[PDB]
Ligand binder design. Structure first.
Ligand SMILES: Nc1nc(=O)c2ncn([C@@H]3O[C@@H]4COP(=O)(O)O[C@H]5[C@@H](O)[C@H](n6cnc7c(N)ncnc76)O[C@@H]5COP(=O)(O)O[C@@H]3[C@@H]4O)c2[nH]1
Ligand SMILES: Nc1nc(=O)c2ncn([C@@H]3O[C@@H]4COP(=O)(O)O[C@H]5[C@@H](O)[C@H](n6cnc7c(N)ncnc76)O[C@@H]5COP(=O)(O)O[C@@H]3[C@@H]4O)c2[nH]1
Lengths: 294, 294, 294, 294
């Protein structure tokens, strides 16, 4: 199997390194008269933060009813601990205000790549987490409990392997015809369908397929579909989206899906996530996962 | 029809208000000796930004190969115009460094609601835009060109109305049985299906339905499905997601879908977005949209 | 008809404004001892220009036979009036040479948008002029004299309208099926073909089509084809090409084609350039051009 | 085969030679008091660049809506790093301004041959690259996948040679009758045609031809057509275009076509670029390329 390097979540040791550098710099400040001097700089920052809120009253007043329907807007305007800044302003000029305005005009407070990356993958509001929730709720929550009955119905036409391997290709190749993927992968038949009236559509139909892979074992197998969506979210270039970020979002999607099916409760063992990169081959990986459980 | 208040995109007039306040404050500074003093504050900011990059070398060194595979990491570490800060540091102490570290330790640089809102909806990497791209590529790109032929095939069993009204309920109510939605809405039949081998599944089936609404007109009609996903992304509470943000994300989804089908090229006039809030009724709105085109 | 804003050629009034500002600044220098001082700056420029030529001997010596097959290279190296610089250098140091080299190293002589725009559209070597020459020589020079005979041959199966309206959509929409463009535009038949042995291909075939547009008039009509090429020169993104520059290049193409058919001598009145932007409609514009000549 | 000398792309070693001459001149300046003197010359340049922008406000104000529809114009007016010039102007007269205006009036900033050559072939907006994109998209993208089927259809009336040799004569001779090119080249038959509704023309027809060359081998063969366009872009003299630049543009065209078919993905091996100069002969070169693959 190929080496799976998916990124871990952020541990948050940067604050620890900042604290250590703070303590070391205080020790070198060792080897009372200057503490007031600290305040002469400190509220100098906390003015400008307030200034940012003042400018954020600018556009938000054009969004009163359409986004916020007064006190809600000013509640949303500045960071929530606003009284510390005024508390520090009271404990004491135009140069500071003009410097903060000269910063805020030219826009030199642009965050870097790693900061927006941690802000993206920290919140659960990016593309990959929402799309993984869509794939979990819309498909996997519904089909997977009805898998064993259709398997038994085809059985009247190996109980360890009655699962649903989801191929998750961390990359670009997504194929509709898996018989073009290898000469070893062969189509045999399909499962009995599933009929559900979902979201106004009456009798929506979910299907499957059964693939026999030999040298001599059957399995159910399909691709994780919405990666295909990402495959058109950068090729068509109508979304601001790059290939390196495409690989990043695919790894994030596999990580989020692994997390969701980790704390899943209905999906007992019926799923089996197979993920890979491009280093024939795919049948060899399928056979390795298939023999691994036995 | 109900009043549709969807939020406009950010115009960006806050920078203009900052510039105006800058010019006015410079005029009051009117009515050369102090400009060097500006630099004594100015690089005082640009040190600390560099300090943030120093702390962002901390956790990123635990993410060398798993996210970035040296120079790529330091390239991603600080904001890209790094030389202006060192240029300003050269033009001239421990108090400034300790103040910036004391800020970065306690974490008082937390962005407000409106800043993270503009950062979210500014980039095309939130939940609603990616999910709208999924609904456009997976379903609307495929089905809609094959609509007229199925309509003509049922016609051999009103050409102005041969469309697909997508009900987009900006709210919480999403129903599977539209006959429970009103006594006026009646199910009649379904369109001939669509069979496509998509993403490894052989013979995936797309269906539709035809609803006759009288007092005396037929139409095709369905719900925008993945809003249902959002309806379970906060009720189950396994995602950090609120109801006010649910209404916000639904309005954002309708806006993004309106934008995508605005610049669409295959979907000629075959879609017709109907969106509403909860103020019987739904049939009255459907009849108003249906009579509006004629 | 929509308002056609195509850009005029460059008149060249910027040199006039420079001359006026020169004369005014000389008048303020009024209200002999300093003229030598002028030379102390003046050759200071004309050294560095020579320096640019010295650095342009660098890469060109790697291109001796492959691009230039000595005296040809140095002839091509610097600007052609080289003796004025040495003439000014003789009339009199290391600071000037080091300043010019410090400029040429960091590359601060990067031209702006308007300068490269005037340099592009000034020379007849851009994309749009060459592609318009291709469309004039390859197609319009050959087909158009043989139009009336094919029209008369279909006439034995309104002489004011026997022309070839070339639709030039200044934009993005280019359609292969003009019957999908409007319900009013209808296909009737095609002209008799044209057979020519061109560029090694024996019996290359040129065709046409005849469209009847009613409410009750026929016309010949086709799209300006190579705009489609521009439609794939930025969407596929394999060329450095933007949409705003796509609209600019399309307007430039229509202007160049209008110029070429202006001074044309074989194409008497048989062409009729119809161009438009996107504000049904297209048939209305076609009927307006069709009724305008009568 | 004749020696193919096509020009390589610009490597960019001239900046390296400038940097080396800078370092050597600094070393001779070795073997603090003068650095301010540098600035007394340095902003003396950066004023005049700003002056160029001032004069470029002159004609552009006559092009407000017709090319740019204020802030867009001034954004396009000067080079984008405008603040460095004012930053250097602040760190300190009429002689400098009058010298820069006296330069800009007489127009002694005319670029040389090699500078406009690198600016032309550097950007992808010259004649040859756009015309090569036209020949790739309009013809080679469409015909070449349908080649093998027509070859097999004539085969039912040597699989290594089923290709399309494009003759690219880097020169002036382009002939319509290849049987006049040599007694050895003989016409036999033509391929089955290709019918496509392209750009409003219904049933546009693409053809081919099959040439048997003996002493005893067949091949498909045609000329690169739009070189013929260049053959009329200087002979008719309606475009500013010379014969030496004609050979240069032809070599540039062959290089760009070689690059495009290098990164091509549909055209597997079906093309085979044959290019030559004029030193019978052409059949000998064709036979050498034909025997080379076997
Ligand atoms: N009304 C309706 N009838 C349909 O048959 C249908 N099929 C898809 N869709 C909607 O279009 C989109 C395309 O599916 P996508 O591939 O992007 O992810 C889909 C897909 O990965 C998976 N899935 C759903 N149905 C099938 C199916 N029949 N076969 C395979 N996978 C399916 O579950 C994901 C989410 O489905 P929904 O989020 O409930 O609505 C889908 C989806 O929004 C449908 N909508
Ligand atoms: N409407 C229409 N019907 C035609 O039959 C036709 N034939 C040519 N053209 C247009 O005129 C011009 C002349 O072709 P050129 O030789 O300069 O390069 C042409 C030519 O090199 C090649 N090509 C296209 N069709 C053929 C063809 N039948 N035979 C050989 N070569 C062809 O592809 C190039 C680009 O074609 P288009 O860029 O899509 O439009 C062409 C072109 O703009 C046509 N336009």
């Amino acid at each position: 199997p190929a080496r799976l390097l998916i990124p871990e979540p952020r541990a948050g040791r940067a604050r620890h390194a900042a604290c250590v550098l703070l303590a070391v710099c205080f020790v070198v400040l060792f080897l009372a008269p200057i503490i007031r001097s600290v305040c002469t700089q400190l509220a100098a920052l906390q003015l400008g933060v307030l200034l940012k809120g003042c400018c954020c009253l600018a556009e938000e007043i054009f969004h009163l009813h359409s986004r916020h329907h007064l006190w809600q807007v000013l509640c949303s305007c500045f960071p929530p601990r606003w009284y510390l800044a005024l508390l520090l302003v009271g404990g004491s000029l135009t140069l500071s205000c003009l410097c903060q305005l000269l910063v805020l005009a030219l826009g030199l407070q642009k965050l870097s790549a790693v900061e927006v990356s941690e802000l993206t993958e920290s919140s659960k509001k990016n593309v990959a987490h929402g799309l993984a929730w869509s794939y979990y709720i819309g498909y996997l929550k519904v089909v997977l409990p009805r898998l064993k009955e259709c398997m038994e119905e085809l059985s009247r036409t190996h109980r360890d392997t009655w699962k649903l391997h989801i191929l998750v290709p961390l990359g670009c190749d997504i194929w509709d015809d898996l018989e073009k993927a290898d000469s070893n992968i062969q189509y045999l038949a399909d499962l009995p369908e599933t009929i559900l009236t979902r979201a106004g559509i009456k009798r929506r139909v979910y299907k499957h397929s059964l693939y026999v892979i030999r040298d001599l074992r059957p399995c159910v197998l399909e691709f994780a579909s919405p990666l295909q969506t990402l495959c058109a979210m950068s090729q068509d270039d109508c979304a601001a989206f790059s290939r390196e970020q495409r690989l990043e979002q695919a790894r994030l999607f596999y990580r989020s899906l692994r997390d969701i099916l980790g704390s899943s409760k209905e999906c007992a063992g019926l799923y089996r996530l197979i993920a890979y990169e491009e280093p024939h081959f795919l049948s060899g990986l399928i056979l390795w996962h298939l023999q691994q459980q036995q």
